[PDB]
Nucleic acid binder design. Sequence first.
DNA 1: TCGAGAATCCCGGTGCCGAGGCCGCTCAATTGGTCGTAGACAGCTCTAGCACCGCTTAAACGCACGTACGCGCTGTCCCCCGCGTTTTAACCGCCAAGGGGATTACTCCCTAGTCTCCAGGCACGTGTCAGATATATACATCCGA
DNA 2: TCGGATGTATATATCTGACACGTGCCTGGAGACTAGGGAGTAATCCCCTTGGCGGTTAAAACGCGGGGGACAGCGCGTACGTGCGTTTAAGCGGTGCTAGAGCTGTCTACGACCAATTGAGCGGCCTCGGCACCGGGATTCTCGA
Lengths: 105, 103, 83, 78, 73, 93, 95, 98, 97
Amino acid sequence: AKTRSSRAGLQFPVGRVHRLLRKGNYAERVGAGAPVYLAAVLEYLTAEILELAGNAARDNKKTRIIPRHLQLAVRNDEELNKLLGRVTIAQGGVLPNIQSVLLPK
Amino acid sequence: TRSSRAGLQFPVGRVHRLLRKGNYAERVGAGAPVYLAAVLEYLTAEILELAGNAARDNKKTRIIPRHLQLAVRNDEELNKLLGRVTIAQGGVLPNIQSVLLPK
Amino acid sequence: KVLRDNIQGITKPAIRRLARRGGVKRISGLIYEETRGVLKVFLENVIRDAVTYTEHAKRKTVTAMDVVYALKRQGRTLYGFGG
Amino acid sequence: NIQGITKPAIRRLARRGGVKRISGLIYEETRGVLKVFLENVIRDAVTYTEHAKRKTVTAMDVVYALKRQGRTLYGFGG
Amino acid sequence: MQIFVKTLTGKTITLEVEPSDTIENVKAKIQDKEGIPPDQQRLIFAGKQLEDGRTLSDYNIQKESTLHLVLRL
Amino acid sequence: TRKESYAIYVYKVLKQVHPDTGISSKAMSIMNSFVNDVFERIAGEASRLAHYNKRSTITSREIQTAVRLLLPGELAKHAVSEGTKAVTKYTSA
Amino acid sequence: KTRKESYAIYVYKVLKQVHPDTGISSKAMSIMNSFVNDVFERIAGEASRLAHYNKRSTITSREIQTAVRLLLPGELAKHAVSEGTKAVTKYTSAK
Amino acid sequence: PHRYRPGTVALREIRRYQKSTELLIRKLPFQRLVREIAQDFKTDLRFQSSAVMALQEASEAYLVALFEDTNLCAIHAKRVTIMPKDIQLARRIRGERA
Amino acid sequence: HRYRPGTVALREIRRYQKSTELLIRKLPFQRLVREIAQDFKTDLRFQSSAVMALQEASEAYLVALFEDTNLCAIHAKRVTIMPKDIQLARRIRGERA
DNA sequence: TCGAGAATCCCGGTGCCGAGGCCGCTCAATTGGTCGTAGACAGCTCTAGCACCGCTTAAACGCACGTACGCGCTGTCCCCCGCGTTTTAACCGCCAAGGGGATTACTCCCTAGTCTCCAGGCACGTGTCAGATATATACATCCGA
DNA sequence: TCGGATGTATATATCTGACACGTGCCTGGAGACTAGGGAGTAATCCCCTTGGCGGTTAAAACGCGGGGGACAGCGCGTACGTGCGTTTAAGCGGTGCTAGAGCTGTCTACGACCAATTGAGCGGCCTCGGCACCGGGATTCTCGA
């Protein structure tokens, strides 16, 4: 196993994260365990979001993913919505909610 | 010294050392601390003048956090600068709704 | 070329459609002016921030990335244009 | 314990705001919202003092936790 | 520089004020040219209830401005 | 000129999760921006905590505390479990 | 004992300069110290972010001026830049 | 002569525009307004198209959120129609200067 | 004799909003803080200044929320606050889900 | 409108402890100076923003008409408010003990830094099918006799 | 409660431009080794927190008369939704053209380190005057008549 990412069985890169952390003036010195942890967290979050989006896209009998599916997946999950409570997504749209009293009787 | 040359009160050297050791950037120029000290001194002088006027209004001689709160909340711009903040022992401004007043 | 009285470009049906997306049913005939004013002040703030940002850049063209920076500064960051 | 916040005390606290009349359920509503607020604040403070590797909660930890939520405080060295 | 103030009666009266002119002085002007005591005069510009003592330059009230007034008995 | 991004890695993760689903360009840009934002937030919080604690080196512990700080409860638990598993796997060899 | 550092003497000098006969309390000192630290932190952070943002590894007067124009509101921003440039030109006049 | 009762077509538009995802305001008037606004701060400024698009998206999101909060306030007041006072009240409670 | 309702209420409004002291009793607040911190960890020790700071922050937050509730209540053409006003203010503020 | 009673503010006197000033001392801010590189400048090169002309048509503006909804007036019934009496626990003041925070001194090992070598990802290029358009039809829904 | 006219979801051809994939290469990442400063560990001290007991008194709790306020019902006159016809500017499709963003080479002034030095800033003491507390009197609303 030559590449560092292959050592930990991870998909996200490790050298790129290490270099970005070093050149990002975050600290005087950095350890040898930070990049793997950060890459694992990022990969987990991306996998969660991607699987939500894939399920949403499948629910609409399509094949490719469009920003509306991402908006639906993000706004249909409570904790993910709270994480992005102050973020606007392009072309996402809104959730189809109508106030009950406005409906005809 | 260096603050004497610029005719300022705040220390240039302390600001320079804090900027250098606060890893904000790889290197810093020689014109930064003077500007920062001047800005800080202007802001604190404005705040102190407002607080002193407020204290002199109430026939006192010392400044207590209530005077600082009144001075900050009275000036529009200073209020909007310190929007999401709170001051200990400050209080609230004397406002009552017009409708709540008796007929 | 001088430009003036452009605020009328935002037509009444556009504002009605914008309200209809939100979920409003009935609209009074007076909200258009304050809607235009709110849009005006929001645009003024964002444009001033972007203009300052590009002025520091020592250029004469305003890119979308400066707009992204200015939007992020006010705590309303946006995804979909890079950076 | 939680019911230790007396009805006259919350009545006075509201009176500082400038409200004239009070209904019956406001006491319970404020008790609930105060419970939520405290839960969050001392949870953050406990996490900070956990990483600090200490058995005592310092006012600096509370100041940092308050700042982290955009509710910074002046008057305690932070 | 001159502005205008309209009451709920639809009458708009010109006010000849200055940036250094204060709300106390402007309400004295309403006293002089209308006779209404300031304790009933309540005023809104841009949805903000002004106190008495500040200056117009602080709020940067532009020329030709129209303010909204009521008489609170 | 090179324009670095997180395209191929996100594509690999998507292929691993779903076998027959495709992605558009705008969605890929959205994911890249989201990843960059999350990375910036975590790194900044970790650096601030390390400077608060009077230390001059960033390690796994401050990253773990930052993850416990920002992310919600169950998300933090899952993320910390995945991170500790990854780090012990890396240090085993 | 720990040699803790503060801004008490400098703000005391400023208060004496602006008002001859006025006293102050300890809580006011703590409040002013915290306010000064907060403002300095905000300005320095924004300036450093912009300096590294426009592909540069050096922080000078210019990005500080831009930040002062950014966070500070209009009229006080103009007063601050005027005071800062006056101080800078006075300092560079001598040597 | 078919005459729908008031509100039915309003419901139809509400559903139709909520389902869709594209923007609503025309482009050229918005570009003219943006150029005129930017004229004051500095003269002879050239704008990229993507910047105008981003401005339009941000304004769209902000206005939609404000209208939603206004509708919430209006239904709280025991009414059906929104009024400017609802806009001012929502802006005040949100914490932004009115 | 007797006082008509609404007068002494205004008297208390002026008196309390003029002063600058806290209203919540210290000991019950300390007990509640200790018990609510017992969940995340046991046998925890607190400095007094930390408790004072927590009390100040909580009081400020509660006063702000009460003022917003009063504003909403008067807007709804009423004089008495009600829990629906509290929930509406919390929802519009963007904190409650 | 007019009557009095508490409530509140102003004044004088007395006592106390936090702030302003003073003295001693150690460490961080000056100062004269060398050396490497960040960038200001000159140039040049190709790209995209601006102006515009003509055609098309879907969108915008103004009008008649009708209805249902914001608003004022009336009444009822009920529920916080202001007093008065009885119950209790907060706070002060003090006394004891210890354990955990802050400091110092020693040791070892983890990472920045350098060199050499190489393959992973990016710019470039190309074939192709997923989905938008257009068309036609059957099912769901809404107003009124 | 029903039925016709309307709008909406469903099925189907089709043609295209965005998307997945093959290729070359070059610049960043990995193997190997050093060297030292930062962090971990072990004692040691003493300061702040926890604990408990007596009192006293101000605050808290409970009950009652009652007048003001929330809420529902009715009447109305207008402001906005809906449909139609008329006007008009947005959008699309090419065409020119020049200002200016972006990359390259230079050489030059500006900032980091290091060695000797000192005085500005911090800790401990004190003393006294500004502020807190109490008694007393003047004023003013505020509810009844």
